[PDB]
Nucleic acid binder design. Structure first.
Length: 756
DNA sequence: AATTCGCAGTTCGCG
DNA sequence: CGCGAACTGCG
C-alpha cells in the first residue's frame, strides 16, 4: 500500500521517496530515475535550439534545460506536437518556466505547475491506499495554559493526551490522581515522553482535531523555547508546517497526519464544529467542554485538575473514535482521486476533480489545458442560466408524489456527449444540439468527460453488485465508501465545467447541461398535466411534486406509475424519470422551502429555518412542533396553541438560554466587511481581546435585553451570565419565533398578532 | 475556490 | 423615519 510520495535532493538531483506499508512493514522505496518536465508549443521547430539554450537563476545555481524531446499528444481530442522539456531538478521549473514562456518563439507552455511528487504518482500509474493493509492509528490532543492578551504559545502546554485501540492516557507535569495519568516533572519531559510514545507505538496515522492550525504550531513553539528536537517523522524529521494560503497544514513524514477538522467541515453540515458538537452529532453521546479559563484556573490553584485531565483524555479518545469513523472514507477518496490521503483530506471539490482529470488525461495522452491567468479569469466572469424553478402553489396539499430524474446532469452529459472536446467539433456525422443555447456536440466518439463519467457510473454499479454478493464485512464497507465517493465525483463534473479556475472550464458545456435539464423537466411537467391530469404543485431543477386534485391516494400512485412508463419510453439515452415517493401531505412555503410527510409519519423538511444554523433553537423547535401538528395531526388549533405557549415562556424568561444561541460563520477577514451584522460585531470585539478570528469561525451569540442595534447587545454565548445578563425575550418572540411560524400559519388565516 | 437557484434578517441612507 | 436597497449567510 502506497501512503505518500515526496522527494529529497541528493548531490543536486531529485530522489523520489515512496512511503509504503507492505505486509505490516513500513518501507521507503527510492526512485532516482524520474525527471521533472513540462511541455512547450513552438511556432517553428528550429526555434527549439534557441530555447533549449535558455537559462535561469535559482538562488545560486544557474538553471539549464537538461534535454528536450518532440512528442505527439492530443489537445482537446485533436492531435498536436509539442516539445517535452526535461530538467535536472524540479525547482528548476518554477525558476525557468516564466522565461521560456516569455520567449517570443514559444506559443505557450503546459503542465508546468504539477508538483514533482504528484507528477510521479500520475506518470507511474501508482494509486495510494490500495490493498489490504491495516494502518496503525494514534490520536493526540493538548491542553495549554491560556491567558487573555498573551502571544501564541507563551504559556506552557499542561497536558498531552493520546489514544488508540489500547486506551487513552494523559501526560502531565503536575500530580493528578487518576490511573490513566502519567506524571512527569516538567513540560520538557512531558513533550519528550510524548515523542517517545509516538516513536515506540510507531503509528501510520496521527489523528488530530485542528492539529494543522493549533496543536502542532503550539508544540513547535514550545519545542523552540525548550530546546527539543521534535523528531516525529519516521525518517527522523520534525513536523513540516506548510502555508496553505489562509491557514497552515502540517505533514509528518512517513506518517499520515489526519486532521479531522477540514474533513468534518467538508463532510457534515453542523451548526458549530467544536469537537464536542462533532462527537455528539456523529455518535449521539454528549461530551462535556472544559473551557480555557477553567483549565488555567485549575492549574494555577492546583484544584480540580482531575476534571481537566479527564477532559484531556476524552479529547484524545473521541478524536481517535472520529478518526476511525472518517479515515476509511478518506482512504477511498485518496484511492479514487489517485493522490495521498494527506492531500485529498485537505482539498476542495474543484481541486479533487482536477487531479482526477489530470491523471486520466495522462492515461489518454491528452495534454492538460492550463489554469487561467488573470486576464482569462476576468473573461470567465459571465454567468449563465441554471435550473428551472417553479413558483410553488403555496399551502397544504394532500396525496402528493415526487417524481425526479435519476442523476439528471450526469445523464445529460453522457447522453448528449457534452465535453469541451466535442463542443462544436467540425467534421462529424452526428451532433446533438443544446436547446435555447444552440451549442452542438459531436456524437461520433465519446468525449473525454462523458467517457470518464460513463466509466464511473458503470464502476459504481459493479461495486453495488459486488457489495451485495461479497462475503466480507470489511470489504463490503470499503466498497460502500468507494461507491459513495464515485457518486459525489460523478455529480461534481457539471459544476466543475462552470468553475472559472478549472483547467477544463467550459461555460458552453455547463449551460448546455442546464438548458437540456430545463427542457426535460418542463416538457415532463407539460406531459403529466396535459396527458395525465395531474396538477404539478412545485418543481425544482430535476424533479417535481404533483397530485390529482380530486383523487384518492391509490389513484395518484397508480397513475403516477402509468405516467412513468409513458414518459420513460419518450426519454432518450440515459435519461430516466423515477418514482421517488408518496407523501400523504405537504406544505410548500416558497421556492426551495417546504415540508412533506410520508405515510409512516416521517417528516422531511428542505430549506426551512429548522435546518439552518443561523436561527435559534427556540425558533427551529417551534417550527418543528408546528409542522408536526399540521402534517401529522392536521390540527391547526394545536399549532397555534404551541406558538402561544412558546411566546409566553419567552416573555416570562423561562426558556433555557442555550436555546437562544444564533450561530453564524465569519466568511472573511474582519476588515473586509462592508457592513457589520451582529456576528461581525461580536467577532470584532473578540478579536480586540486577542481572540483568533479567521474565515470559517462560527460566532455563537445571544441577544441581550435592550434596544437599538442587535449587534450592540449581542454577546458570545460563552460569556452569557444569567445573573448579570437578561436576554431579549421580545427579540426572540418577534424576530425569531414568530417569523419562523408566521409564513406557515398565514395559510390558515392567522397573523403574527394572534400567535403572541 | 463546483454551479445557479432561492429566501430573509440586519443595517443604513434616503426623501 | 418608514422603506427599500445593500450586504450578508446559508440552504
Amino acid at each position: 500500500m502506497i501512503l505518500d510520495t515526496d522527494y529529497i535532493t541528493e548531490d543536486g538531483k531529485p530522489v523520489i521517496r515512496i512511503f509504503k506499508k507492505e505486509n505490516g512493514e513500513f518501507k521507503i522505496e527510492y526512485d532516482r530515475t524520474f525527471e521533472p518536465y513540462f511541455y512547450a508549443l513552438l511556432k517553428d521547430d528550429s526555434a527549439i535550439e534557441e530555447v533549449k539554450k535558455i537559462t535561469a537563476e535559482r538562488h545560486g545555481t544557474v538553471v539549464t534545460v537538461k534535454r528536450v524531446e518532440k512528442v505527439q499528444k492530443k489537445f482537446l481530442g485533436r492531435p498536436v506536437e509539442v516539445w517535452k522539456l526535461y530538467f535536472t531538478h524540479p525547482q528548476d521549473v518554477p525558476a525557468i518556466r516564466d522565461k521560456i514562456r516569455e520567449h517570443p518563439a514559444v506559443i505557450d507552455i503546459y503542465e508546468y505547475d504539477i508538483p514533482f511528487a504528484k507528477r510521479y504518482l500520475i506518470d507511474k500509474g501508482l494509486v495510494p491506499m490500495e490493498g489490504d493493509e491495516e494502518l496503525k492509528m494514534l490520536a493526540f490532543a493538548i491542553a495549554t495554559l491560556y491567558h487573555e492578551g498573551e502571544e501564541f504559545a507563551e504559556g506552557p502546554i499542561l497536558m498531552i493526551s493520546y489514544a488508540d485501540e489500547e486506551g487513552a492516557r494523559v501526560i502531565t507535569w503536575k500530580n493528578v490522581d487518576l490511573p490513566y495519568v502519567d506524571v512527569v516533572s516538567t513540560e520538557r519531559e512531558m513533550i519528550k515522553r510524548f515523542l517517545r510514545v509516538v516513536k515506540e507505538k510507531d503509528p501510520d496515522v496521527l489523528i488530530t482535531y485542528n492539529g494543522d492550525n493549533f496543536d502542532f504550531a503550539y508544540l513547535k513553539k514550545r519545542c523552540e523555547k525548550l530546546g527539543i528536537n521534535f523528531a516525529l517523522g519516521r525518517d527522523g524529521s520534525e513536523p513540516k508546517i506548510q502555508r496553505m494560503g489562509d491557514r497552515f497544514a502540517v505533514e509528518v513524514k512517513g506518517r499520515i497526519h489526519f486532521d479531522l477538522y477540514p474533513v468534518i467541515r467538508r463532510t457534515i453540515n453542523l451548526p458549530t464544529y467544536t469537537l464536542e458538537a462533532v462527537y455528539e452529532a456523529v455518535f449521539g453521546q454528549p461530551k462535556e467542554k472544559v473551557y480555557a479559563e477553567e483549565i488555567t484556573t485549575a492549574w494555577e490553584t492546583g484544584e480540580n485538575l482531575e476534571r481537566v485531565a479527564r477532559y484531556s483524555m476524552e479529547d484524545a479518545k473521541v478524536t481517535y473514535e472520529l478518526g476511525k469513523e472518517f479515515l476509511p472514507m478518506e482512504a477511498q477518496l485518496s484511492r479514487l482521486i489517485g493522490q495521498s490521503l494527506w492531500d485529498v483530506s485537505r482539498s476542495s471539490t474543484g481541486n479533487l476533480v482536477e487531479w482526477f482529470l489530470l491523471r486520466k488525461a495522462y492515461e489518454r495522452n491528452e495534454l492538460a489545458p492550463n489554469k487561467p491567468d488573470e486576464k482569462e479569469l476576468a473573461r470567465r466572469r459571465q454567468s449563465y442560466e441554471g435550473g428551472y424553478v417553479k413558483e410553488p402553489e403555496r399551502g397544504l396539499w394532500e396525496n402528493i408524489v415526487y417524481l425526479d430524474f435519476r442523476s439528471l446532469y450526469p445523464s445529460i452529459i453522457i447522453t448528449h456527449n457534452v465535453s469541451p472536446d466535442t463542443l462544436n467539433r467540425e467534421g462529424c456525422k452526428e451532433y446533438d444540439v443544446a436547446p435555447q443555447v444552440g451549442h452542438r456536440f459531436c456524437k461520433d466518439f465519446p468525449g473525454f468527460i462523458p467517457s470518464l463519467l460513463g466509466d464511473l457510473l458503470e464502476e459504481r454499479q459493479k461495486i453495488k453488485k459486488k457489495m451485495k454478493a461479497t462475503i466480507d464485512p470489511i470489504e463490503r464497507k470499503l466498497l460502500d465508501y468507494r461507491q459513495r465517493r464515485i457518486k459525489i465525483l460523478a455529480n461534481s463534473y457539471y459544476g466543475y465545467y462552470g468553475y472559472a479556475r478549472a483547467r477544463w472550464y467550459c461555460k458552453e458545456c455547463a449551460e448546455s447541461v442546464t438548458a437540456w435539464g430545463r427542457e426535460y423537466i418542463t416538457m415532463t411537467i407539460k406531459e403529466i398535466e396535459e396527458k395525465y391530469g395531474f396538477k404539478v404543485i412545485y418543481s425544482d431543477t430535476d424533479g417535481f411534486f404533483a397530485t390529482i386534485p380530486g383523487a384518492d391516494a391509490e389513484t395518484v400512485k397508480k397513475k403516477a406509475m402509468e405516467f412513468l412508463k409513458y414518459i420513460n419510453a419518450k426519454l432518450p439515452g440515459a435519461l430516466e424519470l423515477e418514482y421517488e415517493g408518496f407523501y400523504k401531505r405537504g406544505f410548500f412555503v416558497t421556492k426551495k422551502k417546504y415540508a412533506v410527510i410520508d405515510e409512516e409519519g416521517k417528516i422531511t423538511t428542505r430549506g426551512l429555518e429548522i435546518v439552518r444554523r443561523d436561527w435559534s433553537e427556540i425558533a427551529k423547535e417551534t417550527q418543528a412542533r408546528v409542522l408536526e401538528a399540521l402534517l401529522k395531526d392536521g390540527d391547526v388549533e394545536k399549532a397555534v396553541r404551541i406558538v402561544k405557549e412558546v411566546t409566553e415562556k419567552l416573555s416570562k424568561y423561562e426558556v433555557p438560554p442555550e436555546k437562544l444561541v444564533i450561530h453564524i460563520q465569519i466568511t472573511r477577514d474582519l476588515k473586509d466587511y462592508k457592513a457589520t451584522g451582529p456576528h461581525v460585531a461580536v467577532a470584532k470585539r473578540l478579536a480586540a481581546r486577542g481572540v483568533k478570528i479567521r474565515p470559517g469561525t462560527v460566532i455563537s451569540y445571544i441577544v441581550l435585553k435592550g434596544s437599538g442595534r442587535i449587534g450592540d447587545r449581542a454577546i458570545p454565548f460563552d460569556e452569557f451570565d444569567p445573573t448579570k445578563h437578561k436576554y431579549d425575550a421580545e427579540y426572540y418572540i418577534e424576530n425569531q419565533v414568530l417569523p419562523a411560524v408566521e409564513r406557515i400559519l398565514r395559510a390558515f388565516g392567522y397573523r403574527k398578532e394572534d400567535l403572541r
